[PDB]
Design a protein around this ligand. Structure first.
Ligand SMILES: COc1cc(-c2cnn3cc(C(C)(C)C#N)ccc23)cc(OC(F)F)c1C(=O)N[C@@H]1C[C@@H]1F
Lengths: 244, 316
C-alpha cells in the first residue's frame, strides 16, 4: 500500500557528491531517516528527523558531509553525501519512524523503522554487541543476545530487524516485545537492564537471514545505534537420520 | 467573515491561538489574523495577551511583523498583522539544508537588527526560534510571536521561565532570575548555529534529555564552519551570562564584518543607539466615506482601529 520509492543506482568519481531521493507513494507527514549498508557489512544510521525540536539530526560521523532535505509539496525526501571516498560505496535506504504521529516532546519515541525503501546502490569508482553467527536444527529454539550500555538499551526500547538476501531489513520486534502484523508468535523479544534477546522458537529453513538489534542512544544529540548482525544458519533436520 | 476580513488557510498555531490567512475586503491587502478565544483563558493568560498587544504597538521595524488592527468582541480577540509570503527559517532549512555563511550572515544581520531594536525600546523577545523568524516575498526576516516578550529595566532580573526549549538559555531551565538581553543573546547563538549547520547544537529525544544537553554547554562544531563563525557562536553560547557577548560586540564581530562592506547594517544599528502623512492616502480614505479628522485622531492616539488599519495598509 504505502511505499517508499527511491532513485536509481549510480557511479560517482571520488571527491564528488551524490543526491538520493525517496518519494512516498501511498496514503501520506513522516519521519524519514537515512541508513546505509556497505557490501557485506552491517546497517548504519546516518541521520534524519528524530525530535520535535530541530529541522534534522545527523550522526556525528556524517555531520560534516550529509545534507538532509524534504519537499513537503511532493512528499519527497532527499539525502546529499559530499566528498565521496571508496568507503562510501553502499546501498542507501530511507526508512520511516513508526511512532511519528505520537511525538510530543514528552513522548519518548521507540525509533522503529515501519517502512523501508528498496535501497539505492551508490558506487564510488575512479556499538551494540551481537554474535556474528547463530545456528540451530529445525524445530529447535535459537536465541540471539544483544548487549549495550545504559545510554542506549538501558534507557530505551529495543527493536529487531530481519534481513533476507537482496532485500531491505524488515521490522521483526518493536518496543522490546511487540510484533508487527505478519510476524508469527515464534519470534519473541525481551530486555533486561542493558541487554536484549530475540528468541526464534520452532526454527524453520525460511528463518535463515541476518538479524539486527537497534535502540536509541541518548549520547550526544541522540542517534540510533545498531548491532553487527547475527547470521542465523538453519542446519539439517533431525528426521534426516535415525541417529540424529 | 471577521469584520472587514475574508478568512481562509490556517498558517499557524499557538497554545491558545490559531493564525489564519486573510484579505482586507476594502483594501485587498493580504494579512495574518491571530484568533484567540477568551473563554479558555485564565486571568494570568488574559494579561499576557494584552501585554503582547501593547509591546507590538511600540515596535515598528522593517524586520519585525507589523501589527495593523486589533479587534475585540465579548468572547474573542483578533490581531491583524502583516503577512510574510516567503515562508519561515525552519521550513527553509528543512527544504534546502544549511545556509552558506554568506547567506546566513545576511539573515543573521537582519535578526540582530530587529533584536537590537527591541532591546533599545526596553523589550526582550524571550521566544526566538527558527519557526518564529518568518520571510517576506524577498526572503527578508520578519520576527513574529511576541507572546512571551516583556518590558525590562536595564539591570533588572526577570522571573518568568519561558522560551522554546532548544533555544532557551541554561538559567531558564535552572529556574534562576535572569537578565533579559543575555537570554536573547543565547537564543541568537542557537539561531546562528542552526542557520549554518541545518541542525541544533543541543538536541535529544525528550525535554529531559534536551535540558541535560543545554546545561552541559558542550556542542559539536562542524568541519565546514569557519574559524571566525565558530568564535562568534562559542562566545554567545556561554554558560555564565556575564561572560556572553553584548549586542554591540556581536555587531562588531570579525565574522560579522566579513565579506563586502555593509553600510546599510551600520545605519540600522546606529538608529537603535539613539514619518509624515501620505496626503494621497488621506484623500483616498476621504472618498471611501471615512472622516479626515477621525482618521488623524485614530493615527495619533494609537487606537489600531478600522481607520488606523486602512491608512497603514493603503501606504503599501
Ligand atoms: C510565527 O508566529 C506567527 C506568524 C505569523 C505569520 C505572518 N505571516 N506568516 C506567514 C506564514 C507562512 C507563509 C510561512 C505560512 N504558512 C506563517 C505564519 C505567518 C503571524 C502571527 O500572528 C499574527 F497573526 F498576529 C504569528 C504569531 O504571533 N503566532 C503566535 C503563536 C501564536 F499563534
Amino acid at each position: 500500500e504505502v511505499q517508499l520509492v527511491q532513485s536509481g543506482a549510480g557511479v560517482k568519481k571520488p571527491g564528488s557528491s551524490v543526491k538520493v531521493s525517496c518519494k512516498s507513494s501511498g496514503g501520506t507527514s513522516s519521519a524519514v531517516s537515512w541508513i546505509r549498508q556497505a557490501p557485506g557489512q552491517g546497517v548504519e544510521w546516518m541521520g534524519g528527523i528524530t525530535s520535535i525540536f530541530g529541522p534534522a539530526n545527523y550522526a556525528q560521523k556524517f555531520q560534516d558531509r550529509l545534507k538532509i532535505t524534504a519537499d513537503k509539496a511532493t512528499n519527497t525526501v532527499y539525502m546529499e553525501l559530499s566528498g565521496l571516498t571508496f568507503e562510501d560505496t553502499a546501498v542507501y535506504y530511507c526508512a520511516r519512524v513508526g511512532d511519528y504521529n505520537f511525538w510530543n516532546g514528552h513522548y519518548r519515541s521507540g525509533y522503529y523503522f515501519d517502512l523501508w525503501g528498496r535501497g539505492t546502490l551508490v558506487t564510488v569508482s575512479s556499538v551494540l554487541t551481537q554474535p556474528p553467527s547463530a545456528s540451530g536444527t529445525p524445530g529447535q529454539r535459537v536465541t540471539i543476545s544483544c548487549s549495550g550500555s545504559s545510554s542506549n538499551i538501558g534507557s530505551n526500547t529495543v527493536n529487531w530487524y530481519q534481513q533476507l538476501p537482496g532485500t531491505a531489513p524488515k521490522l521483526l520486534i518493536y518496543s522490546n516485545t511487540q510484533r508487527p502484523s505478519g510476524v508469527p508468535d515464534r519470534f519473541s523479544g525481551s530486555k533486561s537492564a542493558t541487554s536484549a534477546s530475540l528468541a526464534i522458537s520452532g526454527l524453520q529453513s525460511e528463518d535463515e537471514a541476518d538479524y539486527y538489534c537497534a535502540a536509541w542512544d541518548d549520547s550526544l544529540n541522540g542517534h540510533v545505534v545498531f548491532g553487527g548482525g547475527t547470521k542465523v544458519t538453519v542446519l539439517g533436520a533431525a528426521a534426516e537420520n535415525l541417529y540424529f | 467573515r471577521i469584520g472587514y476580513y475574508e478568512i481562509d488557510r490556517t498558517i499557524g498555531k499557538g497554545n491558545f491561538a490559531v493564525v489564519k490567512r486573510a484579505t482586507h475586503l476594502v483594501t485587498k491587502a493580504k494579512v495574518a489574523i491571530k484568533i484567540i478565544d477568551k473563554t479558555q483563558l485564565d486571568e494570568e493568560n488574559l494579561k499576557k495577551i494584552f501585554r503582547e498587544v501593547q509591546i507590538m504597538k511600540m515596535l515598528s521595524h522593517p524586520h519585525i511583523i507589523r501589527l495593523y488592527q486589533v479587534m475585540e468582541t465579548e468572547r474573542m480577540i483578533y490581531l491583524v498583522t502583516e503577512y510574510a509570503s516567503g515562508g519561515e527559517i525552519f521550513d527553509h532549512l528543512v527544504a534546502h539544508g544549511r545556509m552558506a555563511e554568506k547567506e546566513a550572515r545576511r539573515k543573521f544581520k537582519q535578526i540582530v537588527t530587529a533584536v537590537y531594536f527591541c532591546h533599545s525600546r526596553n523589550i526582550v523577545h524571550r521566544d526566538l526560534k527558527a519557526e518564529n523568524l518568518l520571510l517576506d516575498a524577498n526572503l527578508n526576516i520578519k520576527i513574529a510571536d511576541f507572546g512571551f516578550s516583556n518590558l525590562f529595566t536595564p539591570g533588572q532580573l526577570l522571573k518568568t521561565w519561558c522560551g522554546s526549549p532548544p533555544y532557551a538559555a541554561p538559567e531558564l531551565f535552572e529556574g534562576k532570575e535572569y537578565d533579559g538581553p543575555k537570554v536573547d543573546i543565547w537564543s541568537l547563538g542557537v539561531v546562528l548555529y542552526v542557520l549554518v549547520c541545518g541542525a541544533l547544537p543541543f538536541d535529544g529525544s525528550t525535554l529531559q534529555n534536551l535540558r541535560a544537553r543545554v546545561l552541559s554547554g558542550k556542542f559539536r562544531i562542524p568541519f565546514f564552519m569557519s574559524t571566525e563563525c565558530e568564535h562568534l557562536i562559542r562566545h554567545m553560547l556561554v554558560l555564565d551570562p556575564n561572560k556572553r557577548l553584548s549586542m554591540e560586540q556581536i555587531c562588531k564581530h570579525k565574522w560579522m564584518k566579513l565579506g563586502d562592506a555593509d553600510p546599510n547594517f551600520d545605519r540600522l544599528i546606529a538608529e537603535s543607539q539613539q514619518d509624515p502623512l501620505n496626503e494621497d492616502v488621506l484623500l483616498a480614505m476621504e472618498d471611501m466615506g471615512l472622516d479626515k479628522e477621525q482618521t488623524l485622531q485614530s493615527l495619533r492616539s494609537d487606537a489600531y482601529d478600522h481607520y488606523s488599519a486602512i491608512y497603514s495598509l493603503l501606504c503599501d
